[PDB]
Assembly symmetry: none
Homo-oligomer: 124 residues x 12
């Protein structure tokens, strides 16, 4: 059964893990992390499934390997939020392109996004 | 006759979908219904003869799509449906803010519409 | 004077629609206009010969939030009366009113710095299920 | 150093406006621009001779969830006292604040990976019914 | 004065067409205009700098039956002469004239209560068989 | 009680108009409305205080063949004397008359199964050349 | 050979039999009747054929069974107008939709249409 | 050259049809000719190379479609025709009131046109 | 005064474009307009409330050859300054200038005998590769 | 009898224009017309009472390569002296000259097999900035 | 190898041989001639190939038979310009329709075009 | 990144062609590249996922089409190319005068684009 990866896993001021979905024919903040995620050079361990949840809503379902589950829980700012089976709810403005592509994913990736000038200061 | 709302519960993650696709006289794609298997009408017969739409405004910014679904399609969609028989003869869908805007700017004038089968994703079966 | 809201209830599905077409200074092309459903009417609005909406109707778009605008207007007496006579909902028009735009509609007003180029009236009828939708 | 929200109440229809204008490095379709009515003011804001806003006003766009983004800012004492003087709602500006982007604006911010190319602050005046709306 | 009919004979297939574009108050959208072929011409109508059709030409739509309208017009001297000089058919324009609309064209005039929003001139050339059609 | 045709001759260009306005229950595309110039009048028609037209004026739409439809009406004595007084063509109104719909109008009437939702009578004034056209 | 069902078979003030054609991808007054046509509960006996007759004209051809031929002749206001093989001429405004559907009929029916307030009075 | 009118006699009830279909730069469908059997040109060859149209106004409200039909198509249409060889090289069709209106509003500007086979109806043979 | 050329260098790929939309008297339809890229800008041009381009800007199309025209213009002080402040290229606008049209653009001006019907401003953003194209 | 080119220098922005207008027998899409600014003039050209231009002015369109075409002309003494008198650039008109068509114009000329149906010469005045442009 | 048929082969005032290409789904001045080309009654001896040469440019390649090569060289105003293998360069305005037809030629021909009123006079 | 111009040398007479076809929101056809053999991507895969365009003005009258070509397509086009490997990741094409005009009037707004194979002509082999 799939558990919701809630908004509280985003903590302003910290760096961000961004999910980035390229559709056939979209960035999503995934996890605030204590430091950048870096796999060893030249190395997926999570599946994504884009599914409709409404007349203009989409959810993203995740299957995350034990290996990446531990690395993410290690790196995460909020405490141990990552489970094996999860989902994110997109809002209508975000769901738009997923709907128009009929949920057909060309490619996805996970990127590190730094913090801006006032970064450490928002953390207090 | 009373127009019943086709609500979001009708879309169930992990199952194939019918997509309502509307062209104004630009292009709306709306997940209409989660179905257990696809939908494919008798030799060369067409949706539009079983399904009437009417776009009207519901306020200063929001718009509704009203529909009359004839008996043959009502029965078929209810059999295919994943959620418990949600199709009534007289229904409406609420368009979102952006979709409403394009409908208003088109003066509610539809060029064409259709229902299309959209298959499930990689983890679909598991999400069920 | 007091500016009273022209509320969404004034639009009644199943009836013809009096639309406000607003054209903003700037923009991309002539496909850019903001159409606002203004009032549901029993019959189309028709104006005296040689008159246009601008002869009876002053508008003013103003911000109401960080991504919201309102459209304020002053309606001359003749139009106020014609509009109350035509309205499906009982006599909703007052001299001084405003329409709340939503965030999608407001974007266009805000990006033009509230500067209206022109505006005019349109009458839109009802679709094939219209009588049925009224009941 | 906790950041206070600059809320909608600080925009008062009928009065001049200070507009915050942000453009991102990409993450936006071609003709989408980010303009935010920032503060209703009693009279225009003027900076002193050759002084770029970036000297008094710092911004940082950051995600607050999977969908929503806030714009955090640090305003120096000069501009703070000036804006609080010009403001219509009573002294709402603090040194450390944030402004909530709407869902659409948040998606452009997210798709731009929060990368700001430039920002600015502009005076926009009131419309023909402005003085009347105030009352 | 006597209003004389501008008859259909004044349109001569094979030649360029001076068109009257009429926009009525109300209506559905900006794709709604009534185009009337006005006169076949030897060359396009060109007007003096800064002048438009409305500076030389007053129109008045009036009903002529239960589903017929006529368009009456008064043509200023300069345009009357330019038009007779350009006309393919020999000198048909008089100061005071009317065009009979048919029942299809009249519908649009009638539904707007004869209220013209604006009007202007267009020049339309001849198609690939045009010279051949002249003979 | 034989019904007399109200013919086109009763519409005289240059003079004000009484417009008969009918809308059917369906049997019409969205933006098609049924407006019929009914009588040219020397001055506007006013009803007395709070008196709905349906009290003086009865209508019945009926087919006259496979394609054409007539609108039959019964006009009470007050309105008849009033319309005959205001009329420009000499006393053409009788108690029992019909009006022929055109082919298009007849098709909307036929497709609506002759079902009238409401009807009304409206004053429309004359255009800028009106007084001149009369003569 | 097919005989024209003329306009004189429509007599104002009387109730109407309406032919109603639904095209794939249109009401027509058919016959004025002395009283409503009612078949016995749960019960076609006429064929229609929509054929072009001009660059913007269509005709409707009818084959009517002996049974319905007699019932219609019984019910008709004008005297015994119904023959076995007939046609109606549509005008251009009526032919429009028949032409745009390439004469492809989804369904047809015959409906009773009452008369309005001034009904009996127009008959005199 | 003299342009001859293609009149309504050319459309004979009960037979298959060629439909002229015109798109302006909305959509005109015009029964063009009653044919004894369909029409289907040589491998991958196209009508437009044998058939030139020119829409022009004939008055303040009516419009005509003028056409030049090249020899190969002239012969073929005359062989297929039901009425006695009515196709000449230079002809015109009169558009109706509504069709005229859309032509005028399009400034006589055609995007595309074509000839399409349309089969007979149920009683067709009998009506012949 | 001296009319100085507003040269092509003033357009800088990668930045938003201030466009001049010009509508000529005559022509075929309302799809006929001549769009001229006028100046690349750091942000969209926004004008004061109730003002349009025509309130600050006079144009004059004149021939410069057998198939070339130039567009001359006089820019009022307020717009000159707003434009120099917005321009990507350093302060290019002077009070009196001209744009060279090429032979394709000139054709439309020439066929209208240089007679402008109306004109207005449009702001066009940058496409998906825009930031990258700037470098 | 060698033909001299009438070059672009003879068109001087800011001054009235004589326009050469040619239409071919076919070889042109419907709405393409051939207008050529011919000579800038200090004041309009008038012909004497009932005298068709063809009496003073002869033209011959001929190819000068696979792509380019010239318009050759023979101008009689009266018109030559008159045009040289009116001209702004000093006496540029000779008895035998040619004018180069541009690539587009040359293609219409080539596709029309150089067949001219008629030609004419028209006065076009100057725009609102005309006197100022001259200087 | 194909040789360019240059513009100098067009001499104003003389009559013209016009190449005329009709595209599937364009006139070109070919040769100024001393007198009209006329083949004997009821009688191609040249191939054309429309090829792209640029993002909006097309060239026309010619293969001309010995027979037509001699007749053309005989008739030509400029001296003996015709070789067996040649090409013409079109400009962008001329290339337009060739590009939009994807270089697919429905038919080509060679036509005689006379000279205008000032014809003999431009030759001097 | 520096945008390199795809110049006319890249089009070599006598060889098949790829045609860039652009639709604005009218229709541009541009010979893009001379290829030694056609181009035909893997089962049901689409150009648009390997190829980004951006139309921008370069002056008061001329317009450029800028493009980012992804690695898979870069390698394929360079292998097929007749001229010596001319495809770089970041390039631009100059539109002609007329093409520029339609781009400007469309406000640089592309509806769709594609690459199409166009075969050689009769004398093609010989011209090589
Ligand atoms: Cl208006
Ligand atoms: Cl974009
Ligand atoms: Cl005008
Ligand atoms: Cl409808
Ligand atoms: Cl403007
Ligand atoms: Cl054409």
């Amino acid at each position: 059964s799939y558990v919701e990866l809630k908004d509280k896993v985003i903590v302003p001021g910290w760096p961000t893990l961004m999910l980035e979905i390229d559709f056939v024919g979209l960035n999503i903040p995934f996890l605030s992390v204590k430091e950048p995620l870096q796999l060893p050079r030249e190395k997926d361990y999570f599946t994504i499934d884009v599914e409709p949840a409404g007349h203009s809503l989409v959810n993203i379902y995740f299957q995350i390997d034990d290996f990446l589950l531990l690395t993410l829980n290690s790196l995460s700012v909020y405490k141990d939020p990552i489970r094996k089976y999860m989902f994110l709810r997109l809002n209508k403005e975000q769901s738009k392109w997923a709907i128009n592509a009929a949920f057909n994913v060309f490619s996805y990736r996970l990127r590190n996004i730094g913090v801006g000038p006032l970064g450490p200061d928002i953390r207090s």
